A paper describes a structure:
[name] is an RBR-type ubiquitin ligase which is characterized by RING1, inBetweenRING (IBR) and RING2 domains. [name] has an N-terminal ubiquitin-like domain (Ubl) that shares 65% sequence similarity with ubiquitin, and a zinc-chelating RING0 domain immediately N-terminal to the RBR domains (Hristova et al, 2009). The RING1 domain recruits E2 enzymes, which carry charged ubiquitin and pass it to a catalytic cysteine in the [name] RING2 domain (Wenzel et al, 2011). Wild-type [name] exists in an autoinhibited state (Chaugule et al, 2011); subsequently, autoinhibition has been demonstrated to be common to RBR ligases (Smit et al, 2012; Stieglitz et al, 2012; Duda et al, 2013).
Residue numbers in the entry: 1 to 83, 144 to 353, 355 to 356, 361 to 382, 391 to 405, 414 to 465
The structure:
């Protein structure tokens, strides 16, 4: 039996397997072929992950079936009861999703001198430019508008060292199960669909890589190329395209070239079948021999394998769980003063609390129950 393996390419290379061949054995074959360790590979078939112990017969794999192989090690080590509200993509030295550090400055002079009228309570307050008001303490500054910025919280960063905020990603304090794997993971990406479907960062990676290989990225004229909710929900396309950077440097570079690759195929061209190389090749209208040479292997246009003569090789070329989708819905009193002991009422999502008593007037954090500081401000200014 022969199955096609899609590993960082739109074309699936043929691999010969038996009924008793396990997924781990298939991973081992592709591991030595690509020079990547087997414990880092993941087998995806029709949007579902195939486990190491399962055989070809168990998976119900037949002739000419296409399987995806994605390089991402599964990590169990995660924090469920994390205090952080924000997540950012650190483009060095982390090169992954990390808890964010929210900071404020004057939009005019760019100094940490702007005194806010009120603390932020939602994403709109920190994302929409010139939304929040205040007054700058710097001499002769007309600044009245707040400018919020996010940094990585996993290591020290300079005042200039900013990271892009990922507003779809959230800490799973609500213990919501993932739409694809049903596992309770943290953090989770929340799609902007009516149902607000929750997906773990592992599943989201598998979803994006397989759709890059299947070339099933939805095109929007006033946005570009993006993916909707895995459930196929209407009006759920990821607007903030910086969310595709979480896939890593290699996979995000593939996503960036997607637009240029689609233009070549639209004209009548072909792409390089070799993994890693996805060059937009434009050969002659009726030419079978195609070579990757705009500034390196010869291949057949029909079977997409190494160039040969005569006939092409005889062996030549999703629905979500209803209960899992229902369970994956993200949306579907008083605390005493740590010094005064008088109960204080919470107004909005803002964690910055102040005692209403005239003698105490203590500024404290709602969650931590300690005096208000830069750590609580950066880590969890508002509840999300
Ligand atoms: Cl976030
Ligand atoms: Zn970092
Ligand atoms: Zn200013
Ligand atoms: Zn998942
Ligand atoms: Zn959805
Ligand atoms: Zn090439
Ligand atoms: Zn051929
Ligand atoms: Zn008090
Ligand atoms: Zn706190």
């Amino acid at each position: 039996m022969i199955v096609f393996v899609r590993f960082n390419s739109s074309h699936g290379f043929p691999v010969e397997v038996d009924s008793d061949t396990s997924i781990f054995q298939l991973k081992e074959v592709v591991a030595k072929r690509q020079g990547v360790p087997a414990d880092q590979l993941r087998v995806i078939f029709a949007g579902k992950e195939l486990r190491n112990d399962w055989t070809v017969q168990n998976c119900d794999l037949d002739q000419q079936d296409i399987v995806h192989i994605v390089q991402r090690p599964w990590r169990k080590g995660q924090e469920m009861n994390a205090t952080n509200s924000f997540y950012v993509y650190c483009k060095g030295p982390c090169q992954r999703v990390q808890p964010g550090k929210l900071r404020v400055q004057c939009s005019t002079c760019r100094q940490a001198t702007l005194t806010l009228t009120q603390g932020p309570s939602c994403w709109d307050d920190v994302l929409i430019p010139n939304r929040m008001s205040g007054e700058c303490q710097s001499p002769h500054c007309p600044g009245t508008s707040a400018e919020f910025f996010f940094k990585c919280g996993a290591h020290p960063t300079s005042d200039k060292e900013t990271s892009v905020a990922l507003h779809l990603i959230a800490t799973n304090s609500r213990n919501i199960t993932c739409i694809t794997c049903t596992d309770v993971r943290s953090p989770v990406l929340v799609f902007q669909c009516n149902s607000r479907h929750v997906i773990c960062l592992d599943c989201f990676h598998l979803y994006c890589v397989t759709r890059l290989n299947d070339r099933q990225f939805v095109h929007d004229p006033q946005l570009g190329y993006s993916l909707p909710c895995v459930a196929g929900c209407p009006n759920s396309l990821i607007k903030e395209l910086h969310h595709f950077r979480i896939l890593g440097e290699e996979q995000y570079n593939r996503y960036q070239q997607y637009g240029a690759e689609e233009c070549v195929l639209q004209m009548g061209g072909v792409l390089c079948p070799r993994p890693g190389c996805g060059a937009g090749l434009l050969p002659e209208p009726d030419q079978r021999k195609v070579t990757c040479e705009g500034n390196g292997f010869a291949f057949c246009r029909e079977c997409k394998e190494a160039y040969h003569e005569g006939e092409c090789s005889a062996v030549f070329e999703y629905r979500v769980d209803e209960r899992a989708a229902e369970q994956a819905r993200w949306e579907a009193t008083t605390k005493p003063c740590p010094r005064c002991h008088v109960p204080v009422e919470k107004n909005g999502g803002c964690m910055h609390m102040k005692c209403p008593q005239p003698q105490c007037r203590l500024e404290w954090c709602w969650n931590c129950g300690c005096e208000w500081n830069r750590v609580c401000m950066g880590d969890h200014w508002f509840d999300v």
